[PDB]
């Protein structure tokens, strides 16, 4: 219905919002591209599902989250797929987790704060229902 898609188009203005706040903050600055092939070889043959900032909004736009909790999902596979690849102790590696890291939990923590659950749950009843 109108109704219905008049829920998922609020959903997609809250996700880029969301979106655009992690990624002008400094400390996400690798996770707002994918990563480049010539600089990084080895990262589309070591990482199965790259995922990014900008290719999240290009999700967004094209349709493809109807809730947030998928949202959520690519936003954990930006943080999983960094402390995958970067798993050393030496300091470019844990700068980079914690950066990841900081990153997932900023997502949350906006989403716990400014996600209506009743939203989701309409978004959730609206994708089961299709
Ligand atoms: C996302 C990402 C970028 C990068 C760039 C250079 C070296 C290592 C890197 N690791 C990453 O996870």
Same mark, same amino acid.
């Given at each position: 219905?109108? !109704?219905?898609?008049?829920? /998922?188009?609020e959903?997609? &203005? /809250?996700?880029?919002?969301?979106? =655009?706040? $992690?990624?002008?903050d *400094?400390? /996400?600055?690798? /996770?707002? %591209?994918?990563?480049?092939?010539?600089?990084? @070889?080895?990262?589309?043959?070591?990482? %199965? !599902?790259?995922? #990014? $900032?900008?290719?999240?909004?290009? %999700? &967004? +736009?094209?349709?493809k989250?109807?809730?947030? *909790? +998928?949202?959520?999902? #690519? &936003?954990? $596979?930006?943080?999983?797929?960094? $402390?995958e690849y970067?798993?050393?102790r030496? @300091?470019?590696?844990?700068?980079?987790? =914690?950066?990841?890291?900081?990153?997932?939990?900023?997502?949350?923590?906006?989403? *716990?704060?400014?996600?209506?659950?009743?939203?989701? !749950?309409?978004?959730?009843?609206? !994708?089961?229902?299709?």
């Open positions: 219905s109108m !109704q219905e898609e008049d829920t /998922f188009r959903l997609r &203005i /809250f996700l880029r919002n969301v979106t =655009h706040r $992690l990624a002008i *400094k400390r /996400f600055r690798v /996770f707002t %591209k994918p990563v480049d092939p010539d600089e990084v @070889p080895d990262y589309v043959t070591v990482i %199965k !599902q790259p995922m #990014d $900032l900008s290719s999240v909004i290009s %999700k &967004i +736009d094209l349709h989250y109807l809730t947030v *909790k +998928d949202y959520l999902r #690519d &936003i954990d $596979l930006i943080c999983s797929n960094a $402390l970067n798993p050393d030496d @300091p470019g590696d844990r700068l980079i987790r =914690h950066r990841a890291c900081a990153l997932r939990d900023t997502a949350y923590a906006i989403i *716990k704060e400014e996600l209506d659950e009743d939203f989701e !749950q309409l978004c959730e009843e609206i !994708q089961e229902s299709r």
